[PDB]
Amino acid sequence: EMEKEFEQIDKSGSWAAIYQDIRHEASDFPSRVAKLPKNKNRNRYRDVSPFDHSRIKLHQEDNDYINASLIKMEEAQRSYILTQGPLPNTVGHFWEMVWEQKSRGVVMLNRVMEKGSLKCAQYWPQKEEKEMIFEDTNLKLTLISEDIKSYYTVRQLELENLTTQETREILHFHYTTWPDFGVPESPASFLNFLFKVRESGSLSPEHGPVVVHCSAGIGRSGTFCLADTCLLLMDKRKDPSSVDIKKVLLEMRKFRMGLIQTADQLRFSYLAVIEGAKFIM
């Protein structure tokens, strides 16, 4: 059981060691499309690339590339799109992907500015009466409502395909309190946020996969998917304690490199799953 594994690693301070074994065992697949010179300005970080086998393709004939991966967790019946925070020049591609994949929710785990630098373009409207038009992908985005809470904001957006005049409602879940350095002290507000996303129907199989992002789409975004999938497997299995976090993480790393960036994020993922298991047993 993970609770006892947690105390062992914590009392022995072996987190950096566990983390390094995960790094060593992780899959490595080609990412040739990401490294084409015509895609250089579609990547925020030169060392963070989607694998070719799991990359999301845009339905535009010119250039189908976006820095985004489909993570398919077969046993949990959960899919996620993990992507980078959009760049000034990829905001149109971002919303095209949302439209094409039939996503109902966007989960954002970063602030636009952190540590005095821009981590993400401002890719949604700040006011009801000032809608955004993405001329390159022919989409219009309107803010419908905004509910600001202590730890997160939920926004109701209308996305309109200007080509077909179809409209969809998208929910934007913005976790606003992840600290600039390290991880939250307690996983309580992160779990509360994860339950809120679940309650919305955004993670349900009726819809396309949820879009999850931070700045690179591997660290905080990794923690989100890892916690959700681990808690769902504990509901599904005859024996909840057969769930090995390390195995689940390695299965997720087949689909996108680098998920969980630090030993601290790994420890936080254990704590989130351990605490979430109480509200589930």
Q: Counting contacts by CB under 6 A, is residue 132 touching ligand JFP?
A: no
Question: Rule CB under 6 A: is residue 171 a binding residue for ligand JFP?
Answer: yes
| Cα maximum dimension of the chain | 60
Please report, in angstroms and rounded to a whole number, the separation of the first and last CA atoms in the chain: 14
Q: From start to end of 38-165, where are the E strands? A: 55-57, 65-73, 78-83, 105-108, 113-114, 117-118, 132-134, 139-148, 152-161
Is 44 labelled as part of a ligand binding site? no
Query: Is position 156 an interface residue for ligand JFP (rule: CB under 6 A)?
Result: yes
Radius of gyration of the chain (CA): 19
Q: Does the annotation list 21 as a binding residue?
A: no
Minimum CB–partner distance for residue 233 and ligand JFP (Å):
25
Q: Which residues contact 74 (CB under 8 A, 6 or more apart)?
A: none
| Residue 145 found at the interface with ligand JFP (CB under 6 A) | yes
> Do the beta carbons of residue 270 and residue 64 sit within 8 Å?
no
Q: 241 to 260, contacts with ligand JFP by CB under 6 A?
A: none
For the annotated catalytic residues, the residue numbers are 214
Residue in the structure block whose two tokens are 């566990």: 18
180 is in an annotated binding site: yes
| 147 binds ligand JFP per the rule CB under 6 A | yes
150 binds ligand JFP (CB under 6 A): no
Q: Is 156 or 192 the residue whose CB approaches ligand JFP more closely?
A: 156
Nearer Cβ to ligand JFP (145/164): 145
**DSSP code of residue 244:** -
Cα 193 to Cα 3: distance, rounded to the nearest angstrom:
22
Q: How many Å apart are CA 68 and CA 49, to the nearest integer?
A: 8
Query: In terms of CB distance, is 137 or 202 closer to ligand JFP?
Result: 202
Residue 154 is a binding residue for ligand JFP (CB under 6 A): yes
Note whether 101 binds ligand JFP by CB under 6 A.
no
Is residue 210 at the binding interface for ligand JFP, with CB under 6 A as the rule?
A: no
- Which residue, 30 or 201, has its beta carbon nearer to ligand JFP? 201
Q: What does the binding site for ligand JFP look like in residue numbers (CB under 6 A)?
A: 145, 147, 154, 156, 171, 200
